[PDB]
């Protein structure tokens, strides 16, 4: 079990690396060149740089996340062939630098959605909240404006993608992910890398925009596109946990053999279709974590795992779910779960 | 299981209470009026004040620690009768304010000993270290000077104590605690309070000075003095852990029914009789925390529990062990072990 911890590298991440390496148990981190944009090619030079700054503080670079999934490959445009080629190229670069894990997501226009991104709790901490009620009475562009902070120089940025993905049905997207996998997975194996796709949060349709990975249904389907251990899935218990109809345990046991990454974060049901992020321990939220930790051992999972967004606590300037405190605190609780559970 | 956390109240403790209450899982804290000196009487006014400042931040006052164990009661002087009376008096005050737990220690001259109180680790964190080799080549007074930071005044101060306990032996000291225990235990049962004697650290003799509360053999002798639940023993797995001869888990199963308080701390051996403090998780120490938590469940211990000393991390100014960080990082770890353990 490689205890990981997301890090934005020596840039923007106000979290020094000499501090993360002081977390008890950490085995490494999961980085991502925030410079490059969707579609760019990651040069061995940049990858080597990142990996180095990490190993300097005696931390291993467990895998890179935020990857370049250009809208072309997703929508199904024609330029996708050039981007799927620039993607397989970086894939060769990552393998050349030893990287073996890549996390990615096939989401349409919104990489993430949240109505209230500063919800205060009883303990006086801030959290990200998503209320379906608010998503209804709000225009699709407003969400864009929100997750990208009057910005008119970005208005067309959204109005274009909308007109682009317009017409792309659910099954169409699955097919575009097929084309993508069929041309990136093969090289993954050559370079010896496992790709892990990030589920949708929330795990349900919003703004009539079709999303595939949101339940054991699609998950199973994702694995079918290309039957290969390289075509795996990261497990963000939180993201999927947001939908109470999603039996997290069974799932892990159902498709655990294909989990290459895992975001062990807890969520709280502050209402019907509305919910929030909270502390890792079960008492804090609505997800029985112990049970979840038991299900991972069952599938014999021993890969990289990292706590996900938590809360903005202890008077930190950082936006909730991006600071060191609650995340690091979360990283020790799960090891406590693991240890004991594994002690059987 | 009441998840506790030591707090020095709104004084000296640079750790705001609104921050501790943000630790996931905390159910309360364990305070102590740092104002009063050995032998003083705690007035309901002061106790009520403390309890209040705690409940203000929605935290419960699980119990008070640092208590007034005047050298008179310990050495066996004559003024002990007046102090054992001022002690039973505060005991009445604590009961009047709802307090039900009191931690105390029957140590001679040194309340704690450490040779290097700024030991740097690989991860770049500071820790408290105790090397028996250094304790040998150093004068008894030097330790005093050390744990009380060259004053000629302190010299006499120590020189006095030395003469005060000159001639006192283990069994000699056992009676002094007996005496005291026979006049404090009955008051505890009436006020509805439980006590927990603290084990020495290191759990062995230093500078010739006698010490009882060190190994299992004596631990039983403590309970023996006055067979009653109020006569309990605060299990500090860290101290008892320094001596590899102490079968931590076994003694928990033996005198476990009488444990009224527990400090889940971990120690990392670094030589013969030289150890240091480290992160709570087994991977960063030498004690099997998973196994220890287990033993606590077998006995059915669901009382107050708090992580103890940790390390100086993240460039925290606080002295290693007294900070907020590494201590919370553990309070969520031990919770994992428990949840994971009870999970069957």
- Long-range CB contacts for residues A207-210, cutoff 8 Å, separation at least 24: A207/A110, A207/A135, A207/A140, A207/A143, A209/A108, A209/A109, A209/A110, A209/A140, A209/A165, A210/A108, A210/A168, A210/A169, A210/A170, A210/A173
Domains, chain A, ranges and CATH?
2-344 (3.20.20.150)
CB pairs under 8 A between A and B: 136
Closest by alpha carbon to A202, among A260, A271, A295? A271
Closest by alpha carbon to B297, among A330, A344, A295? A344
Separation of alpha carbons A275 and A287, rounded Å: 12
Strand partners, A195: A102, A231
Q: CB within 8 A of A153, min separation 6: which ones? A: none
Task: Find the helix or strand (DSSP H, E) in which A233 lies.
Answer: strand A231-236
- Mark the breaks in chain B: residue after which each occurs, C to N over 2.5 Å: 149
Q: What is the resolution of this structure in A?
A: 2.9
Separation of alpha carbons B231 and B233, rounded Å: 7
Residue B189, token pair as written in the block: 């049962």
C-beta separation of B199 from B241 below 8 A: no
Strand B28-31 and strand B60-64: pairing? parallel
Residue A330, token pair as written in the block: 């979360």
Write the residue in B24, B280, B284 that is nearest to A279 by C-beta.
B24
Separation of alpha carbons A244 and A264, rounded Å: 16
B335: contact with A, CB 8 A cutoff? yes
Residue A95, token pair as written in the block: 């393998």
B313: contact with A, CB 8 A cutoff? yes
C-beta separation of B339 from A338 below 8 A: no
Spacing of C-alpha A6 from chain mean position: 10
Experiment type: X-ray
Residue in this structure with the two tokens 């410079």, named with its chain if needed: A35
Reduced to 3 states (helix: H, G, I; strand: E, B; else coil), residue A59 is coil
Reduced to 3 states (helix: H, G, I; strand: E, B; else coil), residue A155 is helix
Show the 3-state SS of chain B.
CEECCECCCCCCCCCCHHHHCCCCCCCEEEECCCCCCCCCCCCHHHHHHHHHHHHHCCCEEEEECCCCCCHHHHHCCCCHHHHHHHHHHHHHHHHHCCCCEEEECCCCCCCCCCCEEEEECCCCCEEEEEEHHHHHCCCHHHHHHHCCCCCHHHHHHHHHHHHHCCCCCHHHHHHHHHHHHHHHHHHHHHHCCEEEECCCCCCCCECCECCCCCCHHHHHHHHHHCCCCCEECCEECCHHHHCCCCCHHHHHHHHHHHCCCEEECCEEECCCCEEEECCCCHHHCCCCHHHHHHHHHHHCCCCEEEECCCCECCCCCCCCCCCCHHHHHHHCHHHHHHHHHHCC
Closest by alpha carbon to A274, among A76, A168, A127, A162? A127
Residue in this structure with the two tokens 């051996």, named with its chain if needed: B269
At B50, phi and psi to the nearest 5?
-55, -55
Nearest chain A residue to B57 by CA: give it: A123
Query: Inter-chain contact A22–B58, Cβ cutoff 8 Å?
Result: no
Separation of alpha carbons B2 and B8, rounded Å: 18
Write the residue in B21, B123, B294 that is nearest to A343 by C-beta.
B294
């Amino acid at each position: 079990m490689k205890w990981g911890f997301r890090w934005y590298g020596a840039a923007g991440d106000a979290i020094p690396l000499k501090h993360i390496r002081q977390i008890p148990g950490i085995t490494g981190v999961v980085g991502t060149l925030l410079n490059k944009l969707p579609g760019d090619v990651w040069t061995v030079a940049e990858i080597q740089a990142l990996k180095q700054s990490v190993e300097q503080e005696g931390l291993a670079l467990l895998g890179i996340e935020s990857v370049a999934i250009h809208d072309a490959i997703k929508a199904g445009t024609d330029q996708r062939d050039h981007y799927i080629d620039n993607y397989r190229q970086t894939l060769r670069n990552l393998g050349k630098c030893g990287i073996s894990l890549v996390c990615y997501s096939f989401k349409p226009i919104f990489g993430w959605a949240k109505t209230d991104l500063a919800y205060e709790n009883e303990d006086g901490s801030l959290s990200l909240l998503f209320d379906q009620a608010v998503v209804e009475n709000m225009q699709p562009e407003d969400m864009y404006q929100l997750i990208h902070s009057w910005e008119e120089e970005r208005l067309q940025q959204f109005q274009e993608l909308k007109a682009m993905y317009a017409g792309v049905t659910e099954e169409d997207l699955v097919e575009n992910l097929r084309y993508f996998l069929e041309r990136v997975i093969p090289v993954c194996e050559e370079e010896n890398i496992k790709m892990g796709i990030h589920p949708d949060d929330p795990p349900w349709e919003i703004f009539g925009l079709p999303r595939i990975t949101k339940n054991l249904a699609d998950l199973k389907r994702i694995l079918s596109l290309v039957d290969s251990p390289a075509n795996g899935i990261t497990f963000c218990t939180g993201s999927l946990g947001a939908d109470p109809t999603n039996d997290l345990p069974t799932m892990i046991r159902e498709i655990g053999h294909r989990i290459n990454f895992v975001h062990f974060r807890n969520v709280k049901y502050l209402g019907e279709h509305r919910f929030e992020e909270t502390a890792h321990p079960s008492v804090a939220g609505s997800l029985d974590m112990a049970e979840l930790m038991q299900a991972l051992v069952d599938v014999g999972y021993e890969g990289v795992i990292r706590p996900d967004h938590g809360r903005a606590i202890w008077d930190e300037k950082a936006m909730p779910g991006y600071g060191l405190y609650d995340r690091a605190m979360g990283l020790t609780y799960i090891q406590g779960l693991y240890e004991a559970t594994k002690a059987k």
